[PDB]
């Protein structure tokens, strides 16, 4: 009859939307190999189809939400029954397929455990973090790292309304850094309509339904640094932390870089920290260091958590995205 999609366009007060620098780890490269074997990206316009997890209990493959309710963390569900889904797990060294009869958080967890147990693993996990680094001046620019128009002030419990959106120190740097275990991808619906009773699609008119069609597991951080050191000094120090050796539980970072980060105003949004399924926001280098140091091997019992996801429109199965623009 007709397919309507709503894909947000968000203007940011940045001069550039693309990361200044980035590093891709072997494991993340190999996962994409497995995905492929089996977008506008300019400084002034950037399409984002990856959304960092903000509501862990609702972020499971096959979940269906009103797309206009994601940015404020409401995630209003659309609860009509779904057809069973077919999902593929792309690992660094394997590709595993499963069927989930009734998409739910518990069903995803059970499927993940089964896939982790079945998967072939080759060589040793390197534990290197991927990282993506960008200078910033306004806290709203961190929406880039989250991949969507989230409320940065509420996530980080900071007042950035009005003139407080601007950093107070000389230099601002943020980064997104990840250790990826695997990516789950949902097959397109067999009959073109995710709903078990296809006529329920028409009942979702006006509810802007999107379904979670890809979920990546691992651990993730988004760090914000405000410092009176220079961009090059902060950026070097940040990379030194992210790439430092870990010896008997100690981050073997050079002393000057540690001092820069300790002296800075440093917050990290963490998904997949040890012990918790919740997201955490920490302040200070010590908590950042602890997260890096304890980022260990993935196992079936400790597979990480959902760290980011993609969604698709139920009307036509196209990918849901945010377009970021400058000015
Ligand atoms: Ca159907
Ligand atoms: Na390094």
Q: How far apart are CA 196 and CA 157, in angstroms?
A: 41
Strand 305-313 and strand 280-283: the pairing is: unpaired
Owning domain of residue 148:
9-313
Could you give the 3-state DSSP secondary structure of residue 315?
coil
Q: How far apart are CA 138 and CA 152, in angstroms?
A: 10
Could you give the 3-state DSSP secondary structure of residue 305?
strand
Ligand 1 geometric centre to CA of 114 (Å): 26
Reported as half-sphere exposure (CB side, CA atoms, 13 A), residue 63 has a value of 24
Please name which of 221, 187, 208 lies closest in space to residue 308, comparing C-alpha atoms.
221
Residue with tokens 């698709």: 312
Ligand 2 geometric centre to CA of 292 (Å): 14
In a domain, 162, yes or no: yes
Ligand 2 geometric centre to CA of 240 (Å): 5
10, exposed or middle or buried, with CB in 10 Å at 0-12, 13-18, 19+? middle
Q: With beta carbons less than 8 A apart as the criterion, state whether 54 and 155 touch.
A: yes
Ligand 1 geometric centre to CA of 191 (Å): 5
Q: With beta carbons less than 8 A apart as the criterion, state whether 209 and 64 touch.
A: yes
Q: How far apart are CA 318 and CA 60, in angstroms?
A: 18
Question: What helix, strand, coil percent values describe the chain, rounded to 5?
Answer: 25, 35, 40
Ligand 1 geometric centre to CA of 128 (Å): 41
In a domain, 3, yes or no: no
Could you give the 3-state DSSP secondary structure of residue 105?
helix
Ligand 2 geometric centre to CA of 313 (Å): 41
Please name which of 124, 156, 163, 157 lies closest in space to residue 297, comparing C-alpha atoms.
124
Ligand 2 geometric centre to CA of 27 (Å): 18
Take residue 73 and report the two structure tokens written for it. 């963390």
* Ligand at shortest distance from the CA of 190: 1
Angle between helices 231-243 and 285-293 in degrees, nearest 10: 30
Distances (CA, A) of 35 to 15, 167, 204: 33, 39, 31
In a domain, 13, yes or no: yes
Ligand 1 geometric centre to CA of 162 (Å): 47
Please name which of 221, 243, 227, 129 lies closest in space to residue 173, comparing C-alpha atoms.
227
Resolution for this experimental structure (Å): 1.9
- Count the Cβ atoms, other than its own, within 10 Å of residue 281: 14
Residue with tokens 């949902």: 186
- The DSSP string of 211-274 is EEEEEEEEEEEEEEEEESS-HHHHHHHHHHHHH-EEETTEEE--HHHHHHHHHSEEEEEEES-T
Ligand 2 geometric centre to CA of 26 (Å): 15
Residue 63 has φ and ψ, to the nearest 5°, of: -65, 145
Residues less than 5 Å from ion ligand 1, measured at CB? 83, 191, 193, 198
Cα torsion through 124, 129, 132, 134, rounded to 10: -160
CA angle centred on 104, ends 102 and 107, rounded to 5°:
75
Ligand 2 geometric centre to CA of 67 (Å): 39
Radius of gyration of the chain (CA): 20
Please name which of 323, 76, 322, 319 lies closest in space to residue 204, comparing C-alpha atoms.
76
Ramachandran category for residue 37: left, alpha or beta (phi over 0 → left; psi -120 to 50 → alpha): alpha
Residue 139 has φ and ψ, to the nearest 5°, of: -65, -25
Q: Give helix then strand counts, H and E, for the chain.
A: 8, 16
In a domain, 1, yes or no: no
Ligand 1 geometric centre to CA of 39 (Å): 28
Ligand 1 geometric centre to CA of 91 (Å): 29
In a domain, 99, yes or no: yes
- The DSSP string of 11-40 is EES-S--S-SEEE--HHHHHHHHHHHH---
Which sign does the torsion angle of CA 178, 43, 154, 231 carry?
positive
Ligand 2 geometric centre to CA of 236 (Å): 9
Ligand 1 geometric centre to CA of 294 (Å): 43
Q: How far apart are CA 236 and CA 259, in angstroms?
A: 12
Ligand 1 geometric centre to CA of 300 (Å): 32
Ligand 1 geometric centre to CA of 193 (Å): 4
Chain Cα centroid distance, residue 57: 15
Residue 200 has φ and ψ, to the nearest 5°, of: -70, -25
CA angle centred on 245, ends 244 and 249, rounded to 5°:
115
In a domain, 324, yes or no: no
Q: How far apart are CA 54 and CA 149, in angstroms?
A: 12
H runs (alpha helix) in 266-312: 285-293
Q: With beta carbons less than 8 A apart as the criterion, state whether 306 and 59 touch.
A: yes
Distances (CA, A) of 155 to 73, 158, 236, 252, 272: 10, 8, 26, 30, 16
Obtained via which technique? Answer: X-ray
Domain count along the chain: 1
Q: How far apart are CA 46 and CA 206, in angstroms?
A: 27
In a domain, 260, yes or no: yes
Query: Kind and range of the H or E element at 283?
Result: strand 280-283
Residue with tokens 């920490």: 282
Query: Kind and range of the H or E element at 8?
Result: none
Ligand 1 geometric centre to CA of 195 (Å): 4
In a domain, 322, yes or no: no
């Amino acid at each position: 009859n007709s397919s309507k999609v709503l894909n947000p366009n968000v203007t940011l007060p940045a001069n550039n939307l693309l990361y200044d620098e980035f590093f891709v780890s072997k494991e993340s490269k190999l996962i994409e190999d497995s995905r492929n074997n089996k977008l506008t990206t300019t400084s002034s316009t950037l399409t984002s189809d990856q959304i960092v997890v903000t509501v862990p209990q609702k972020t499971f493959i096959g979940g269906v939400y009103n797309s206009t309710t994601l940015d404020n963390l409401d995630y209003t569900p659309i609860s009509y029954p779904l057809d069973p889904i077919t999902v593929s797990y792309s690992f660094p060294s394997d590709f595993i397929v499963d069927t989930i009869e009734r998409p739910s958080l518990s069903s995803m967890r059970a499927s993940v455990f089964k896939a982790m147990r079945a998967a072939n693993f080759s060589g040793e996990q390197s534990l290197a973090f991927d990282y993506n680094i960008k200078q910033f001046s306004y806290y709203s620019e961190l929406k880039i790292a989250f991949g969507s128009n989230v409320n940065i002030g509420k996530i980080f419990s900071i007042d950035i309304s009005g003139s407080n959106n601007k950093i107070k120190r000389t230099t601002g740097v943020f980064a997104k850094f990840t250790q990826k275990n695997f990516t789950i991808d949902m097959d397109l619906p067999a009959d073109g309509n995710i709903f078990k009773n296809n006529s329920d699609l028409a009942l979702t008119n006006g509810k802007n339904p999107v379904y979670i069609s890809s979920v990546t597991y691992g651990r993730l951080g988004i760090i914000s640094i405000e410092s009176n050191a220079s961009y090059n000094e902060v950026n070097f120090a940040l990379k030194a932390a992210l790439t430092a050796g870990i010896v008997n539980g100690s981050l073997n970072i050079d002393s000057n870089s540690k001092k820069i980060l300790e002296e800075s105003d440093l917050s990290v949004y963490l998904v997949g920290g040890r012990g918790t399924d919740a997201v955490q926001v920490i302040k200070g280098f010590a908590g950042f260091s602890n997260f890096i140091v304890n980022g260990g091997q993935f196992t079936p019992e400790a597979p990480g958590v959902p760290i980011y996801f993609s969604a698709s429109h139920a009307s036509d199965n196209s990918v849901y995205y945010t377009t970021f623009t400058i000015d």
